[PDB]
From a paper:
Biochemical data suggest that stimulated GTP hydrolysis powers DNA translocation, allowing EcMcrBC complexes bound to distant RMC sites to interact and induce cleavage on both strands. Here, we present cryo-EM structures of an [name] hexamer and [name] complexes from the evolutionarily distant archaeal species [name] (Tg) and the well-characterized E. coli system.
Symmetry-related hexamers abut against each other in the crystal lattice, deforming the planar arrangement of the six subunits in each molecule. This produces an “open-ring” conformation in which the subunits at the loose A/B interface are significantly splayed apart, and the small subdomain of the F subunit becomes highly disordered. The individual TgMcrBAAA monomers, however, adopt the same overall conformation and organization of nucleotide binding, as is observed in the cryo-EM reconstruction. The distorted appearance of the crystallographic hexamer suggests a greater flexibility at the loose interfaces, which could more readily be influenced by crystal packing forces. The asymmetry in the ring also explains how crystal packing forces could induce and/or sustain the open conformation observed in our TgMcrBAAA X-ray structure, as the loose interfaces likely have a greater propensity for flexibility resulting from the fewer stabilizing interactions.
Author numbering:
A (entry chain B): 198 to 267, 270 to 283, 288 to 290, 301 to 348, 351 to 450, 455 to 584
B (entry chain C): 199 to 264, 270 to 294, 301 to 584
C (entry chain D): 507 to 584
D (entry chain E): 202 to 585
E (entry chain F): 202 to 436
F (entry chain A): 196 to 253, 256 to 261, 274 to 293, 301 to 344, 350 to 465, 476 to 542, 566 to 575
The structure:
């Protein structure tokens, strides 16, 4: 927890990077209750997932008139930047910001906007050190999936700790679309989740890495030791899963470290034949109760992902599975009975049930 | 059974494989009994992806009013809100007015535009306080079938569904999340009520599903070509169907006379498709095999001639375009030319040394003898 | 087509620009289609240029025909 | 002309110096009796920026004082041309006088309206008129083939994408697919939705370079619609009897005599050989044909403007010799051979060996200028 | 100079550092009596992103009552200069074309500054639409002897795709198929179909650099039109 | 060093090339030239670190903050010298606004180009500081960034010579003026041969005085003559606690190999030798920038690959014996 709680005020923000299967979305949804204690993410902690069709919606933008003929700048993320000083106007400002209904009361916008025009001089007439300290968190899931030079024009420079509210070298810039000039608070911190298996640098922006930190949180098989596994899933049915996972490993040969060493020996074979970002994460094995569901997640989730990885490359898939050239017997893929004119050799997918499926998983270790 | 377990455990199922296998058929067959309805519109919606879908027509986009523009909900947002408001019945006045606005297939009034826009303020305020042990069990079930899912830009279409479609991140899960949509500022989540089914073709690598993250959300079940169904006993059962009219029994002697002009080998079309598909797996990928649907409604020996010469031989001539030594190896006639063969070598020889064949329309008992020899 | 001029107009304006676009600057291949590969300086469609390239190149030229010399080039194809 | 009446359309192709565009324009002015574009005479030049929307039908944002004048499909140049012939040929039919003032007087004044006027009541009138034209556009197939002719010139057809700029026309421009043909076809258009067909009234003449193999007619099914008349470079034109014949017919201001004097001495200066220019071009052409493509041959248009010897010296050193250096860049020998000075490295040589060599051992040559009767001399050597 | 009166277009080839761009405008100023690139002596520098739409005609957004949805066809640099030369030349003419009310409106119009009025553009169209049928009915006798000569400089012509930037100018730039040649041609513009040709009093002077051979001019056909003069770096 | 030869040949060529390989003390001696005399320590104007990001619709184009963040220094390099008359002092009121401009008075903001059309032609040409350097120039395509830049910047084709040259741009014109005081060099280098001298015709605008990394920067009286610039908080003589031809037999023992068959302008920097102070940091000179940094560069070539040490499992030994 030491690298989790206060490795955030050093820089502006930080992105969680890793292959799929690593719960970066889950580990960003854990600090929302360990630091903000907001089980409902409506106030003081927001959650948006970026995608390739999001623009003029992380700032202020001219939207339609509130049920008229024909027209006002609607804000959608400055509402989380005007949300970070009371700890009557500002004291009630937060509800105007958290306006669940149409917040456009015939005059509610109006009260809100003027209150904004003062801020810029209420802080503009205020010194530095009183808000250098402050007693929020916005999560952008799949941050690489949106155009960072379109959702932010020239505004990701303003999230650094020096260019925020309470710094010596800190400024405010007039917002386009008739927005009072804006700046970012220092207590506003961004936790992002990124996928690196698609590309090692997916969002290839120079100003992204110079204002965000990166962490390569690895697939941890240590989370598959049966003892380790029960510590996740028990937090009337805390005991019904106990004999379920006990007889799971008992059919598996009473081995607690089975699914741990199955994953890491496969992932180290993928790391040789493919990139290191192509490792299989650990979430594919958390919802495993019986060997039937292990057989299901093997045959219907990770094997066609592996066949996608190596396509028509029977040798590579066989080697990663450790068939290692076995052409018959308990083999996931079995060589066909024909050989082509120029040396072509082919294999077919075989279904393995019973004890022949577990022992075929033993030869991959 | 493979489909109902995985659609309950993972929340999303993609059926993959070569064409001709029942991926689209088993999608309809699964939902016409779990809904007990043969027409979509209620508890059931069937769409089909292509490259002209968008996020704006799948979740929400700005559409003009016949008033400048308004945000209308896409097909997934209509059925996810329908699945949630149906599940909030048996778990009550205003949400009954909300369900009748979503099911209102006629267009909606401008007075009822902001009436519908006001009722989902109440619903998303409601589910933010209801505990995670009530929304997990909803007594109806909703199904959306996305046929040909790899023919559209899925990550652009599935805007916020990358985070939402996970089982524990649905409504009533251990990690239940509610995301604010960037259009209209409205909060949204997907219930555990709605189960999505996808169908895809593995033949086209151009449309291949290479997104690992999207792959984790769904469970992939492959419907393989099964030549076993082409056996006389099984093809008689596969043709014994909803057509239970006088032509039940009269179709079987047409099947009996057809195999009687094939040597009464009841495993002939099974061995024909099996020996062919294992040869396509060698010289090309496994995902270019012939599907069993090409040989289902064949009843006469002329009907097989229509299948063989007009569907699969022009398709095999496109796999191996101007590659005669490969296409005659699938038909086990590499060294055989100038005989009872599908392609006969032109007598002339190329100036620089080239040599090539011409397809011959083998008809009559000749046709069967060029098919047996493939076994 | 019904005249000998009409078949001369199909050959010299439609199919010979087609074959010279098929095998562009490939003279020994296109003369094999008319089986006149070793046959130069006659009633041929492509006559051999007397000039020869410095590093060994050889070129041809399209010859126009009319009358009884035309059909002998056609029976040469048969 | 014979191919134009039988195939319906002819693409003229060859090296650039041959007279392809000129023959096209001369033929059109003579047949139409119209020496100006418009009134049944159309000239266009295809380019990559050309589009199906521009040629046949596309949505055009036409802005007018009144709002919403835009957001209206605009028929393209070809469609306008097909219409303006169709219904002008519908202005005279034997005893099938259906309407006879609609097809003769509704939208000939609208389609050939030189003021591009979006008269919003009359624009709708255009549309109503077209639909009737189409139903009565099938009065009877037999009398369909009898109208007055119209013509369009597409220059540099290779430069544009014919497969895209021309769309449904690939099916239609075939002659029997036109109106009154043995297999008549009427097509449905995507944007406006109005039906469309080409008549035998409209003829299309195309111009094409084949020295550029990038813009080449690789569309083999598209070649079946057209007819290809290869105009080789006729060096026979550089002869004095023709050089005068093709250079004075239009102008009769007594400038013919001056040209006669100008070239009479010219030939006299050139060994009194009236074939000297012809030989230069022909020898050069055969030589170019061997070492490179035959379509990179020099055409006669470079040498038709020669009236004095000093005019021809500007043609060699500013048009012909810089063209040959682009054929063979740092390929000195091939240029040297085409001038029949293959190994010569001396005076009376266009390219001269540079003495130094690369550490890698490479060698180079230098172009040298030549002038006077002395320069006239090197030309004959290429012959030898 | 003599090559401009015969070929029409000259291209001053040479490597970088040669006096190619400088004498391109040194010869231009002394043959138009205009020190500044005003009516004549216009200057254009190509680049790799230069387009056909900027050169002849294209769709551009314009503000009519500050509404940006109005997209109207904008005439390019060449269209404007070619039109200006022709209109000034038509200033001297017989009775059919003697009346200069319309001619002066059009010429001043091209001569005008950047602003194009919502109410100015339509008058330009009326005059231009007239202008085609007037010169279409005018004989080819007076049209070859246009007195005021216009000139255009194209710098760095190797940078752009000249075969794409030149459109219909593959045809119209030859001297015998300008307005008043033996084979006079007039073409229809692509956007909305307006008639257009080049009068003989407009002359183009290019400037090429042979270092970038790969995207240097490769269209052999385009070469016949223009004349070529090598410029070696004479010290 | 080089601080006494450069200040005498500025009005001849305008821009001079003093080339060097990447990594060495080059990106500070560039910052040396702008801070020492004028001491302009403010951004936005005349003191901006500048390396382009190779993204260009690209003499000036690439529209939308309109065209470029620093696309108007060529006028301003003489405009402050051409201000000695509301016309004379209106340029500076808008350009000292670091804010986006309002649409309330847009027509008044772009109406000022009207008077100076023929005044700058009537301006005396000998009436004549600001520095904008291009970095990351040859990393991307230099032919894309070089439009009409090569002919305009030479010796006599400025305005201070006899050869007269104006500029031309579309979209409402706006021709500007050119001084010889302008400082736009651009880093000329060959760290990648794919783009290096792609425009081989570069003759009459530059020269080549090679700036090798100075080998005399390793002596005990010459190591940290340069290395004290950064110190501010009492660090001038903390390094007098551990000093009690030292390490010169490290550089020319390696950087004479860089020239023979090795590529010359892939040299290693001495900016990493900035603050060698303690006794623990004596591992980074033989095991970090000597042996592994020169190992995996030849094509499995032992001579290039095995030449790591001048002063399988990787062997371990510490440098005291
Ligand atoms: N308790 C716990 N559950 C985990 C952990 N990692 C994965 N999980 C399980 O799987 C999920 C992990 O988050 P996950 O969905 O894998 O991250 P993600 O960022 O969405 O993954 P992706 O979107 O980048 S493919 C959780 O919902 C939980 O069910 C972990 O470290 N702890
Ligand atoms: N009864 C029965 N019919 C089947 C079965 N598999 C396929 N069919 C029949 O095959 C035909 C086509 O099957 P279908 O599911 O539509 O292929 P597909 O999924 O579209 O394949 P594609 O999408 O890759 S082109 C239909 O007539 C269908 O009923 C099966 O298992 N049982
Ligand atoms: N009078 C006359 N002139 C001819 C003849 N052949 C060519 N010319 C002249 O040659 C020149 C070019 O001919 P033209 O037909 O315009 O070439 P083109 O097809 O346009 O050439 P391209 O470069 O675009 S591929 C013109 O001056 C033309 O008049 C001919 O037979 N008679
Ligand atoms: Mg995630
Ligand atoms: Mg299907
Ligand atoms: Mg032409």
């Amino acid at each position: 927890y030491f690298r989790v709680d206060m490795l955030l005020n050093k820089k502006g923000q930080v992105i969680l990077y890793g292959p799929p299967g690593t719960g970066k979305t889950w580990i960003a949804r854990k600090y929302v209750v360990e630091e903000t204690n907001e089980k409902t993410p409506g106030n003081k902690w927001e959650f948006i997932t970026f995608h390739q069709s999001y623009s003029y919606e992380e700032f202020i933008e001219g939207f339609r008139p509130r049920t008229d003929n024909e027209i006002r700048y609607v804000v959608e993320d400055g509402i989380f930047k005007k949300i970070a000083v009371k700890g009557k106007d500002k004291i009630h400002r937060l509800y105007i910001l958290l306006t669940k209904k149409e917040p456009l009361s015939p005059t509610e916008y109006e009260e809100y906007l003027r209150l904004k025009r003062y801020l810029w001089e209420l802080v503009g007439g205020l010194p530095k050190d009183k808000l250098k300290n402050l007693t929020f968190y916005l999560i952008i899931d799949e941050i690489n999936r949106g155009n960072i030079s379109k959702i932010f024009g020239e505004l990701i420079t303003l999230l650094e700790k020096d260019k925020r509210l309470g710094g010596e070298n800190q400024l405010i810039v007039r917002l386009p679309y008739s927005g009072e000039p804006f700046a970012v608070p220092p207590n506003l911190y961004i936790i992002g989740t990124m996928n690196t298996a698609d590309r090692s640098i997916a969002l290839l922006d120079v100003a992204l890495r110079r204002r965000f930190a990166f962490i390569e949180v690895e697939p941890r098989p240590e989370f598959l030791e049966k003892e380790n596994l029960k510590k996740i899933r028990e937090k009337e049915d805390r005991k019904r899963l106990n004999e379920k996972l006990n007889e799971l490993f008992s059919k598996l040969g009473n081995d607690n470290y089975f699914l741990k060493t199955l994953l890491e020996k496969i992932n180290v074979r993928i790391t040789v034949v493919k990139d290191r970002d192509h490792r299989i994460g650990h979430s594919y094995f958390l919802n495993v109760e019986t060997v039937e569901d292990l057989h299901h997640v093997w045959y219907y989730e990770v094997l066609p992902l592996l066949m996608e990885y190596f396509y028509n490359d029977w040798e590579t898939i066989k080697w990663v599975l450790n068939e290692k050239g076995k052409e018959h017997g308990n083999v996931f893929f079995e060589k066909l009975r024909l050989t082509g004119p120029n040396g072509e050799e082919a294999y077919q997918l075989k279904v393995l049930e019973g004890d022949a499926f577990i022992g075929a998983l033993k030869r991959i270790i």
